Design a protein around this ligand. Sequence first.
Ligand code: HEM
Ligand code: HEM
Ligand SMILES: *[C@@H]1O[C@H](CO)[C@@H](O[C@@H]2O[C@H](CO)[C@@H](O[C@@H]3O[C@H](CO)[C@@H](O)[C@H](O)[C@H]3NC(C)=O)[C@H](O)[C@H]2NC(C)=O)[C@H](O)[C@H]1NC(C)=O
Ligand SMILES: *[C@@H]1O[C@H](CO)[C@@H](O[C@@H]2O[C@H](CO)[C@@H](O[C@@H]3O[C@H](CO)[C@@H](O)[C@H](O)[C@H]3NC(C)=O)[C@H](O)[C@H]2NC(C)=O)[C@H](O)[C@H]1NC(C)=O
Ligand SMILES: CCCCCCCCO[C@@H]1O[C@H](CO)[C@@H](O)[C@H](O)[C@H]1O
Ligand SMILES: O=C(O)Cc1ccccc1Nc1c(Cl)cccc1Cl
Ligand SMILES: O=C(O)Cc1ccccc1Nc1c(Cl)cccc1Cl
Ligand SMILES: *[C@@H]1O[C@H](CO)[C@@H](O)[C@H](O)[C@H]1NC(C)=O
Ligand SMILES: *[C@@H]1O[C@H](CO)[C@@H](O)[C@H](O)[C@H]1NC(C)=O
Ligand SMILES: *[C@@H]1O[C@H](CO)[C@@H](O)[C@H](O)[C@H]1NC(C)=O
Ligand SMILES: *[C@@H]1O[C@H](CO)[C@@H](O)[C@H](O)[C@H]1NC(C)=O
Lengths: 552, 552
Amino acid sequence: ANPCCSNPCQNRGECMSTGFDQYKCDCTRTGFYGENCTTPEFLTRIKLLLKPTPNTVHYILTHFKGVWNIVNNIPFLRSLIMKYVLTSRSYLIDSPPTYNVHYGYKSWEAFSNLSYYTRALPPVADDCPTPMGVKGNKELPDSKEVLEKVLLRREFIPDPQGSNMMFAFFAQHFTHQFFKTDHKRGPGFTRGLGHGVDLNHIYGETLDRQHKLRLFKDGKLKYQVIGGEVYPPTVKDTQVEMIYPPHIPENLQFAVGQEVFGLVPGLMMYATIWLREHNRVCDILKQEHPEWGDEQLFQTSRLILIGETIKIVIEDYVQHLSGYHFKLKFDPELLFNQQFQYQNRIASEFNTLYHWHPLLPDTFNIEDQEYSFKQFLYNNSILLEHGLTQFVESFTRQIAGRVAGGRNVPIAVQAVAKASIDQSREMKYQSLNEYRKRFSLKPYTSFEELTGEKEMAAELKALYSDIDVMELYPALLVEKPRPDAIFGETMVELGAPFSLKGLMGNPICSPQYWKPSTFGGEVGFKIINTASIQSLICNNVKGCPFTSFNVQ
Amino acid sequence: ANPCCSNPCQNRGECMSTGFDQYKCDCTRTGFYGENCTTPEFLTRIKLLLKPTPNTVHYILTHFKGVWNIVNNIPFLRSLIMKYVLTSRSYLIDSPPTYNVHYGYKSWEAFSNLSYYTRALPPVADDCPTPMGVKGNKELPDSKEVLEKVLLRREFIPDPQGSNMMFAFFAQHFTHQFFKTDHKRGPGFTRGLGHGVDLNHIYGETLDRQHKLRLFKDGKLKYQVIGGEVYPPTVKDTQVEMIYPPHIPENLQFAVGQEVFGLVPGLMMYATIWLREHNRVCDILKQEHPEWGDEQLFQTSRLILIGETIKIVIEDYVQHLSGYHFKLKFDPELLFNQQFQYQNRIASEFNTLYHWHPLLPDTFNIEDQEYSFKQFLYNNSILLEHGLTQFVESFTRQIAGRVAGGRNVPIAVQAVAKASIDQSREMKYQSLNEYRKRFSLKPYTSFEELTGEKEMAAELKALYSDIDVMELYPALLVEKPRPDAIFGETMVELGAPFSLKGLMGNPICSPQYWKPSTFGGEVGFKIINTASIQSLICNNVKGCPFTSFNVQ
Ligand code: HEM
Ligand code: HEM
Ligand SMILES: *[C@@H]1O[C@H](CO)[C@@H](O[C@@H]2O[C@H](CO)[C@@H](O[C@@H]3O[C@H](CO)[C@@H](O)[C@H](O)[C@H]3NC(C)=O)[C@H](O)[C@H]2NC(C)=O)[C@H](O)[C@H]1NC(C)=O
Ligand SMILES: *[C@@H]1O[C@H](CO)[C@@H](O[C@@H]2O[C@H](CO)[C@@H](O[C@@H]3O[C@H](CO)[C@@H](O)[C@H](O)[C@H]3NC(C)=O)[C@H](O)[C@H]2NC(C)=O)[C@H](O)[C@H]1NC(C)=O
Ligand SMILES: CCCCCCCCO[C@@H]1O[C@H](CO)[C@@H](O)[C@H](O)[C@H]1O
Ligand SMILES: O=C(O)Cc1ccccc1Nc1c(Cl)cccc1Cl
Ligand SMILES: O=C(O)Cc1ccccc1Nc1c(Cl)cccc1Cl
Ligand SMILES: *[C@@H]1O[C@H](CO)[C@@H](O)[C@H](O)[C@H]1NC(C)=O
Ligand SMILES: *[C@@H]1O[C@H](CO)[C@@H](O)[C@H](O)[C@H]1NC(C)=O
Ligand SMILES: *[C@@H]1O[C@H](CO)[C@@H](O)[C@H](O)[C@H]1NC(C)=O
Ligand SMILES: *[C@@H]1O[C@H](CO)[C@@H](O)[C@H](O)[C@H]1NC(C)=O
């Protein structure tokens, strides 16, 4: 009955119901006027012409290696590019945040409640005639049918980009500090009240948890030594709550920041590496500041590890992910003369677009072995078995699956995929073309254009009927990958804004924070500005094994 | 001890201890370089020369009333100015926030814990030799001696500016939504987790409290009708907790947003006026939006009242306070092409500088009466006695005390003043000249320059000895008032930045929020853009009693 159910306003214009069956579009600052915000203004038309498509830019960012090789070695030229990357993106995010799963109109409740994941697009009204508004049938296609016909993997499809397991598990370990759905409340709720890279997955969300994990001497994190190796402490010794099946022996129940990282040895691998790093830097700091106490050493280390993480995520992780020939740069100063909000609010859609389960292989091969999911889950004996060096070497060698090709979701994890579909419908998500339009992308006109092939398209067309009814989540895993790329345009176009906003949006990147003193001086500052996923492994893993985010 | 105990780093430089007996200053982006960041850079020296003192600017703004009359009628000219007052100020605030009562160095704990009041200047180290660092004696002068010698009022000193009781109580009611010290934790802790004008003093901090106060029909707030007049509901009917002495009759225990507003009829006066306004606007909104439900009407109303509040505080309240001939303007758009952080963190110092108790008279005269403090406190029968119209008329006529003259703190409220002194020492505050320097002011060279007279100066000099040991809080109440002004330069220079930051820092002022649709259309937007203390008291109190913030 909601007259705005039809998503009338185009170009970021706000729909407001003016009477029981009439509406109105607020075209303020949209660049257009007209009942529906579609009549462009003069200056708008000019910017529309000189605007290259995302796929055009991606092409230039990934081609002409010889050229990028030049730009890449011209400090001022290289800064000029990155600054444009960092800004051109950010304007797509609403900050301060707007809607959430319960509010399709701006309200204080929405803006102030930190328990909610924010929303790029308002949910579909509850009194709308169809799930996606007015188009389609009273009900979306069976999620199980969608799951089986185009999502479940028959044969393992490797990633053309070379993404290995150090990459897959890094993304998992990292994204899991801000993606912590509060299942007790609902899918649109989060437990990561920091809404970003606060490294609570190492230190804990609560002060109470943080103090249980702390040694309280030299600012160090409690740990244990097994077979001459440093690993996280046990739950029996720290009292911090972790999620472990009832059959796990107390001496294997490791206690880390994130209560769920004990369920996957790959997550516990990074957990140990970052614990080792925290205390490593603690020694560096005490060395320079013999006058410093335990609290100030611990606090400053955490600030440094946050900076190292932002550094690695932008120069290693995303660097590999993007496939750009342009060398990304983590330099908060590039935004200092720009208009930018040093704040963030984790989006639900970002969380949805990040369910990269197709990444996982059919077996985890560490050294001589080949473990099935059943054997890998909650099994830290495996880690204690081969050791961090073996894990790093083995996972650096194992290729991970492609994400956007289609039909590559491991069957061992199909429940997770079904739920992604279901919960998205539960949170009244808007269609894939609604989100495409929202992120300055051209809506797909057919299922064949979306997939780039004929079979899955046929399958989808028989399930949904309208391409304008197609759902976001599945569409992302089935989208036509970019040339030899792991992702489609929608994945990269939605994820980059949300990503940089939370990476650059961090307080430590603000002017008052970006300076030596904040990190204990030029020695601490340097740790950050020189961080690499390689030096992260080298300094903490025995044998300084070689590591990379791609199958060498 | 610390070696940084003596505040060596000048010009906002950061002191970081570099060894048991050595220190260093991070002069990053300060404009100065040198072991103590005192050596100005070139451009710095040019800017200095071309920067008029706070007292110069003040003078220009409170004079040339003819010029001001012109500018004030040249839309773009006025805009030009106000934008300058908006921006020129804001750069003095650290945002995102930095220190708190427990952290003198930036830490994540400091930046993430919302339970703390932030701090404009780091507290003095606990291992410092003296209370203010290195200067002065092991102990500051007796607070009771300070209290009695220069703070307690012998004869009531009226405010030369004409401030009446509608002003004094307005400031109290308003400032009490973000100044809510959590005494269970300590002075440096707050309960106003919104850190700004979120109008929790009307709606409640918690959703639980908010729902107890809500009618749940037309988005209205519960209320009661007494003698044909609308008043807040009772605690017996809503179950919301309020602070009332044991002898107050249930039928007098009014339930409002702020649990403490039942302790002063002046506070409960504004409480009723703003409750009346919320439902008033609810009627306006239902009129335009028959299709809207209770939740959307209530939520939109609250967004409108927040806007009205920001409008009135800047164009009525501050307008009167400043004494400027320049007409202030509340227009979030003036910052749209500027670099500004749409966020805030209530400062402890702001809270301290706002203890305007000298404002209160010796008796509250409503109509024929003259009530002593003893009779006025927690007495809502008085309100029910004379009514809102009588309170508005009476309080608009009664002059309020001067704040900066010296010796004008009502004796009926001396405990409050003593504590302000104590708690400030408790939170390890820095000296008055430290804060003056921090806010681009020139430190006072003598107690006579601070007070502008000889007696109180002599009294203070005998108590503190060094002007560089002089405490902030007392200094504010004893400072030489500006010509016929209610405040001194330190008061206006510290408060303005903290003030606009939280007023302009509100989300509703952000681009995504500043548009008709957010406020239910052009009708709701208009309510905000044409708000004033006159129309507030005019659409809500019987007879539309004339009202103003100054004695007519
Ligand atoms: C080691 C294999 C993995 C297992 C056993 C696993 C299992 C799961 C399960 C059971 C959930 C809950 C899903 C739901 O109910 O909605 C989940 C959520 C999630 N997984 Fe995985 N996952 C694995 C690897 C990954 C990887 C490598 C990524 C991609 C970077 C990933 C990203 C996500 C995301 C973003 C969520 C939601 C996080 C949250 O809100 O709590 N997962 N996964
Ligand atoms: C109507 C008579 C008033 C009484 C009986 C009164 C009483 C008090 C009391 C007992 C406190 C706690 C003091 C402490 O121990 O720190 C307080 C705090 C305060 N008062 Fe008043 N006051 C009155 C009027 C005002 C007015 C007119 C203002 C002017 C803005 C004002 C501003 C403050 C401030 C800013 C605080 C701090 C609140 C907090 O941090 O939680 N008061 N007052
Ligand atoms: C952010 O929004 C959340 C979602 O609404 C809020 O969580 C809900 O808070 C309600 C009020 O506290 C809870 O209501 C229940 O109502 C019954 C009947 O009045 C009470 O008896 C219950 O005690 C009360 N709580 C529970 C657990 O039943 C909701 O249950 C609760 N959870 C959900 C999923 O809605 C958050 O409170 C809010 N956060 C803040 C800071 O306001
Ligand atoms: C913001 O900072 C506040 C001040 O540090 C935190 O409040 C403190 O949290 C502590 C840990 O929860 C409490 O410590 C007490 O320690 C004993 C010994 O371990 C425990 O048994 C107690 O249960 C625990 N709490 C109490 C009430 O005894 C402090 O008491 C508590 N209060 C103060 C004034 O320090 C806030 O938790 C923190 N906020 C967030 C969101 O992290
Ligand atoms: C009539 C007003 C006289 C003001 C001068 C006060 C000088 C210090 O006088 C103080 O006054 C306080 C208020 O009663 C008392 O509680 C103190 O005991 C008293 O020392
Ligand atoms: O940066 C991340 O958090 C990973 C990620 C996930 C989804 C989409 C994009 C990205 N990263 C990313 C970024 Cl941040 C910029 C440009 C291109 C890419 Cl693919
Ligand atoms: O604006 C307030 O909240 C009151 C207040 C208190 C202390 C200091 C300044 C102000 N207001 C104020 C402001 Cl916000 C700007 C310019 C001039 C003045 Cl006096
Ligand atoms: C927008 O386009 C026209 C009005 O210009 C009208 O036909 C249409 O219904 C409007 N909205 C939608 C969703 O079509
Ligand atoms: C766990 O790992 C150990 C050692 O690698 C292995 O022997 C055991 O079978 C595994 N347990 C399960 C349930 O897979
Ligand atoms: C700053 O002034 C000089 C160094 O330029 C030195 O004598 C002094 O100790 C420094 N610090 C302070 C607090 O004076
Ligand atoms: C409260 O107010 C009433 C009515 O105005 C007055 O008669 C009474 O004396 C007051 N009570 C106290 C304790 O002051």
